[PDB]
């Protein structure tokens, strides 16, 4: 068996500086177009006709404020293809209608698929187990739930996150004010997985570096390691005693330790994804009913929970007219919620 | 009374909170940065109204 | 009847017991507020 | 407070059912031949 397919497979799997692979055929153009689309938009392209915002270096934005913004709410969930019925093949109009947003979201999605396929392909060639790809399932679930499922549940792509620093900050604040997203136990598990993962990263790196064996004469200890060496470079036994005596418990099994390092942040991200799927439908953890019944009846009952809801109400009333221009909100001064003086 | 305006905020389980809403509440704005140990209060009831536990903790 | 040769013993070590109980109890401490609503 | 009346048994079984599963598995491991 040495036909054109096998010859191609040979070329695709050459050991070169940048490995290609069959997965490369999907991954390279899609990742390139997504990145190039973002750079192109943030440098040159407005959001005047979709959002009423300037969004590019060309208009005077900086790195923090540039974005490729979502299409107008009136576009619905249009794929907004360049040759589609909205832009009708007109590149300029396509940019003005927000076509770069779906360009980037879709090429980005297919590129992420390509990258996970790359993780599988390389693992298979090299003869290792595919846990890196498996762990990548968490980035996939986040991207798909946030940039795709979420706006698909809402009225249109307009409410997806826009690709920009400040734009993303706005997304966070929208979620606080409208969804009370910090109250959601799926977000809370996400937070624990992220902060716990960061904790594990720090503590494991630090522990290894402070239980090193002296394997050289240098006071800078990095050179006293050889990639081909059979011996552990640090003492698990000493590490175990230290942590047992400091914290009460300690790892004793290195395999379990590293598995756990995969488990914690990967599971956290998956949990946050589930919460966002509910938010696509406005299925929020917004309230505690018992709290509201009590507070409604008793004007002296106050908790941090009720205090945060008043903040959410402020966010909604003060941000909506400019953040949701298609609604044509006109909120007269007298109806705006405000405490004393401010 | 976290903000020193005689508007007490409930933080404990027995006083209407669950695990998510519950808190030990910061000491009063009337206190500011003044040191407020138990023995500065006329009584424990006073100490508690003004948020003494927050500082101790 | 002839015995089944596919049977395998099952195990849960003490550490795994402690980790599992911690997971369950913490999940309960977290979700209980929402079950009471 | 007007809580959900099923909250108590929901929480109780949420804790008890998997905890018991784990306890069963642990004890039968301990009793296996050393």
């Amino acid at each position: 068996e040495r036909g054109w397919f096998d010859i191609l497979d040979d070329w695709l799997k050459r050991d070169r500086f940048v490995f290609v692979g069959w997965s490369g055929i999907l991954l390279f153009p899609c990742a390139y177009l997504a990145l190039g689309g973002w750079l192109t938009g943030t440098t040159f392209v407005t959001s005047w006709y979709t959002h009423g915002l300037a969004s590019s270096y060309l208009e005077g934005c900086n790195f923090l404020t540039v974005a490729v913004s979502t299409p107008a709410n009136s576009m619905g969930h249009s794929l907004l293809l360049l040759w589609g019925p909205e832009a009708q093949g007109d590149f300029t109009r396509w940019c003005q209608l927000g076509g770069l947003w779906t360009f980037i979201a879709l090429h980005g999605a297919f590129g992420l698929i390509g990258f996970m396929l790359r993780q599988f392909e390389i693992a298979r060639l090299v003869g290792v187990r595919p846990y890196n790809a498996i762990a990548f399932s968490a980035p996939i679930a986040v991207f798909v739930s946030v940039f795709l499922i979420y706006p698909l549940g809402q009225s249109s792509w307009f409410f997806a996150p826009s690709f920009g620093v400040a734009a993303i900050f706005r997304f966070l604040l929208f979620f606080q004010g409208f969804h009370n997203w910090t109250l959601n136990p799926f977000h809370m598990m996400g937070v624990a997985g992220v902060l716990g993962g960061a904790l594990l990263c720090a503590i494991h790196g630090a522990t290894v570096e402070n239980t090193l064996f002296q394997d050289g004469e240098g006071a800078s200890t990095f050179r006293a390691f050889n990639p081909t060496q059979a011996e552990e470079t640090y003492s698990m036994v000493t590490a175990n005693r230290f942590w047992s005596q400091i914290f009460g418990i300690a790892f004793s099994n290195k395999r379990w330790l590293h598995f756990f390092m995969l488990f914690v942040p990967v599971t956290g991200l998956w949990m946050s994804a589930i919460g966002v799927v509910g938010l696509a439908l406005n299925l929020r953890s917004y309230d505690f009913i018992s709290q509201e019944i009590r507070a409604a009846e008793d004007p002296e009952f106050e908790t941090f929970y009720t205090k945060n809801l008043l903040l959410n109400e402020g966010i909604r009333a003060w941000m909506a007219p400019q953040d949701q221009p298609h609604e044509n909100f006109v909120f007269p001064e007298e109806v705006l919620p405000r405490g004393n003086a401010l | 009374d976290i903000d020193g305006i005689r508007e007490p905020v409930s933080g404990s389980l027995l006083y209407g909170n669950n695990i998510i809403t519950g808190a030990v509440v910061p000491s009063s704005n009337a206190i500011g940065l003044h040191f407020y140990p138990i023995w500065e209060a006329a009584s424990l009831d006073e100490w508690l109204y003004n948020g003494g536990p927050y500082q101790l903790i | 009847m002839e015995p089944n040769p596919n049977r395998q013993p099952v195990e849960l070590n003490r550490t795994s017991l402690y980790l599992g109980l911690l997971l369950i109890l913490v999940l309960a401490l977290l979700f209980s507020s929402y079950f009471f609503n | 407070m007007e809580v959900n009346q099923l909250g108590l048994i929901a929480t109780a079984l949420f804790v008890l059912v998997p905890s018991v599963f784990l306890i069963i598995l642990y004890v039968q491991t301990e009793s296996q031949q050393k």
Binding site: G248 | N18 | L25 | -
Partner: peptide, 30 residues
């Protein structure tokens, strides 16, 4: 009953800490 439930779960957690620390399977060098 809510308060009792919260405090009970918490108490079980603290007990679990105790067993996990003082009645752990001892690590052994083979």
């Amino acid at each position: 009953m809510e308060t009792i439930t919260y405090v009970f779960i918490f108490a079980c957690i603290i007990a679990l800490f105790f067993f996990a620390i003082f009645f752990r399977e001892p690590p052994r060098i083979t």
